[PDB]
Amino acid sequence: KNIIIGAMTALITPFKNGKVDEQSYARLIKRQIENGIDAVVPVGTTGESATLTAEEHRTCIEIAVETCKGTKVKVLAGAGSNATHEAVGLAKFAKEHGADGILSVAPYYNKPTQQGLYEHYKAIAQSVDIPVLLYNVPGRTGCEISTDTIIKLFRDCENIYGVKEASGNIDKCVDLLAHEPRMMLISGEDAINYPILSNGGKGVISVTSNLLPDMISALTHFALDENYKEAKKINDELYNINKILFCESNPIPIKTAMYLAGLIESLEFRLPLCSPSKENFAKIEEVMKKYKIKGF
Amino acid sequence: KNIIIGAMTALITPFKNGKVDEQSYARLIKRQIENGIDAVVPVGTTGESATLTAEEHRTCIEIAVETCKGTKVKVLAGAGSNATHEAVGLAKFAKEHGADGILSVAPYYNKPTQQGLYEHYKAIAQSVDIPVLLYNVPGRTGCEISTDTIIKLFRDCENIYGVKEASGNIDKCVDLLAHEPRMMLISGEDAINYPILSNGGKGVISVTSNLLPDMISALTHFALDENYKEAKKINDELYNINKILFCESNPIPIKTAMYLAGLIESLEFRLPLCSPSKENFAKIEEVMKKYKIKGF
Ligand SMILES: N[C@@H](CCCC[NH3+])C(=O)O
Numbered sequence: 191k192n193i194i195i196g197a198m199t200a201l202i203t204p205f206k207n208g209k210v211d212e213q214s215y216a217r218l219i220k221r222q223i224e225n226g227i228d229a230v231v232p233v234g235t236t237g238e239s240a241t242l243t244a245e246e247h248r249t250c251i252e253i254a255v256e257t258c259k260g261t262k263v264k265v266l267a268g269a270g271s272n273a274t275h276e277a278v279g280l281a282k283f284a285k286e287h288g289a290d291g292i293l294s295v296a297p298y299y300n301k302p303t304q305q306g307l308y309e310h311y312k313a314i315a316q317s318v319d320i321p322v323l324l325y326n327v328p329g330r331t332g333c334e335i336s337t338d339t340i341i342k343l344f345r346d347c348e349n350i351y352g353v354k355e356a357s358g359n360i361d362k363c364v365d366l367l368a369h370e371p372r373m374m375l376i377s378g379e380d381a382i383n384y385p386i387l388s389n390g391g392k393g394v395i396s397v398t399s400n401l402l403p404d405m406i407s408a409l410t411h412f413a414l415d416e417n418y419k420e421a422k423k424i425n426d427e428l429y430n431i432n433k434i435l436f437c438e439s440n441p442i443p444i445k446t447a448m449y450l451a452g453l454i455e456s457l458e459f460r461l462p463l464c465s466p467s468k469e470n471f472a473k474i475e476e477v478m479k480k481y482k483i484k485g486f
Numbered sequence: 487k488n489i490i491i492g493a494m495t496a497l498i499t500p501f502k503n504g505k506v507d508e509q510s511y512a513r514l515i516k517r518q519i520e521n522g523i524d525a526v527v528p529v530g531t532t533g534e535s536a537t538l539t540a541e542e543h544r545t546c547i548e549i550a551v552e553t554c555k556g557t558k559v560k561v562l563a564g565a566g567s568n569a570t571h572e573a574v575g576l577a578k579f580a581k582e583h584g585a586d587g588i589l590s591v592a593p594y595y596n597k598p599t600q601q602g603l604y605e606h607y608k609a610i611a612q613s614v615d616i617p618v619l620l621y622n623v624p625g626r627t628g629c630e631i632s633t634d635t636i637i638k639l640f641r642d643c644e645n646i647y648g649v650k651e652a653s654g655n656i657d658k659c660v661d662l663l664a665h666e667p668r669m670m671l672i673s674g675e676d677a678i679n680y681p682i683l684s685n686g687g688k689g690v691i692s693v694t695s696n697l698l699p700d701m702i703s704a705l706t707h708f709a710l711d712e713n714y715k716e717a718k719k720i721n722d723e724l725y726n727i728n729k730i731l732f733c734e735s736n737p738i739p740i741k742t743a744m745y746l747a748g749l750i751e752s753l754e755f756r757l758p759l760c761s762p763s764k765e766n767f768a769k770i771e772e773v774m775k776k777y778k779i780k781g782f
Pocket residue numbers: 239240241242243244247271272567568569572595
């Protein structure tokens with residue numbers, strides 16, 4: 191299989207006057223490239239995929255592709271949807287516009303059965319010839335891709351090469367890699383990046399890397415080299431920021447932190463996302479003091 | 487406030503050859519009208535709102551309006567979205583095409599904060615002048631509209647008149663009506679229709695009424711007329727079917743039952759929804775035997 195692994199960033203999507211700030215987006219991606227990130231994920235959960243239009247979602251994938259061109263950095267395009275025809279549409283777009291692979295979140299809200307999830311991802315995988323990474327985040331979607339379903343899709347569909355797990359379930363991560371050690375397990379939960387990598391996970395799709403790409407990149411590559419002491423030290427050091435970045439729903443804290451660090455011009459969301467509480471704003475600002483934040 | 491209450495049906499959306507069967511859709515609504523239903527909800531969760539296009543969603547609202555025109559039955563159009571600009575668009579469409587009100591599910595997947603939910607619904611309520619019913623279903627959306635937020639919204643926005651509760655939390659239903667008895671609490675969970683009505687809830691938005699509209703209507707009207715013994719009697723009778731209709735994720739069982747009753751032509755869903763397992767198909771068929779299903 192072709193794979194997309196290593197340190198990866200679930201990119202925030204900046205807004206200026208309620209529109210996607212495309213110049214800021216490219217600058218942010220270029221900051222990720224220059225700080226050791228192996229791949230970028232445009233328009234995931236952290237990129238506010240829900241509130242982008244179909245056209246803006248596609249524009250952000252194109253900016254990612256264009257910015258990473260002539261570099262070693264890959265684009266794992268956000269392409270999930272709770273409608274299979276929508277997810278197939280995004281997968282085919284990402285393939286046709288030069289993405290290296292796609293991320294595809296499990297359908298949210300409509301709670302398909304395991305049989306339905308299998309057919310959903312099978313339809314997506316068959317529509318393209320690039321790698322497909324499953325994405326399990328039951329706290330957001332209301333459904334779970336079971337270990338059996340993941341393993342069946344990995345074994346049955348050529349391009350499905352692993353899963354981004356955001357479920358706080360290290361038992362499942364053991365279950366997945368003990369029964370199917372060939373898949374690429376990707377951490378979707380920054381606080382437990384090191385435990386997942388130390389069990390044979392092969393990368394992270396990180397929120398924190400938006401702010402601290404150098405630290406997440408170093409953690410991941412240390413762990414991949416089995417330098418566990420060094421990877422753990424960074425994971426332990428990052429714990430306070432990893433958790434405060436979820437004091438409110440992601441991406442409210444990370445955009446707050448990026449704004450506080452001067453990396454985006456305005457603290458702007460699309461409704462129903464909005465600014466953090468005044469208190470949580472201050473809690474984020476205080477935790478940030480303990481870290482060295484790279485500029486442009 | 488202007489309100490829409492009583493016995494209401496979350497209409498299934500039948501498909502034929504992968505498109506909305508607009509003739510069957512109108513026929514099903516007329517079966518609801520003739521069996522005492524007070525309002526119909528086109529394109530809710532049960533109507534597979536996630537997998538309809540913008541156009542199909544709008545077409546279904548129009549058919550409901552047209553079918554209920556010159557009748558006593560109201561249209562409470564499904565208009566929710568996890569993107570506020572989308573929910574405002576659907577709210578304005580529903581107002582402009584003659585719906586009596588809108589249902590608006592809490593944003594799914596992107597998990598807004600309580601402040602974000604307040605602003606989301608304020609934007610929706612201010613966009614139209616027809617009644618707005620909030621819709622809380624945390625098992626599907628991943629977020630909860632808190633009792634405080636509901637109440638604030640009810641008191642601050644003239645068009646917001648209540649909530650459809652689908653959270654299995656009768657304590658919350660006591661909380662809501664003890665602190666704000668003027669709101670219309672609507673049951674969105676068939677198995678506990680009677681407990682919610684007997685505490686002062688004023689209607690149901692039903693899945694089961696698709697199959698047994700006469701029974702759900704009678705249950706609601708007994709309860710509103712304070713015949714709690716007869717409303718409870720029907721609620722008890724319906725428990726087996728109310729429960730089997732969620733053996734798999736709604737609307738997979740209800741469409742299976744509608745197809746088994748000969749009320750829709752094909753057992754067709756849009757992916758990621760799919761046929762129930764063979765075992766659940768037979769279990770649904772078996773439970774149905776105990777009920778008398780009105781035809782057309
Ligand atoms: N709000 C819808 C549409 C998003 C379309 C672009 N990502 C959803 O979250 O699925």
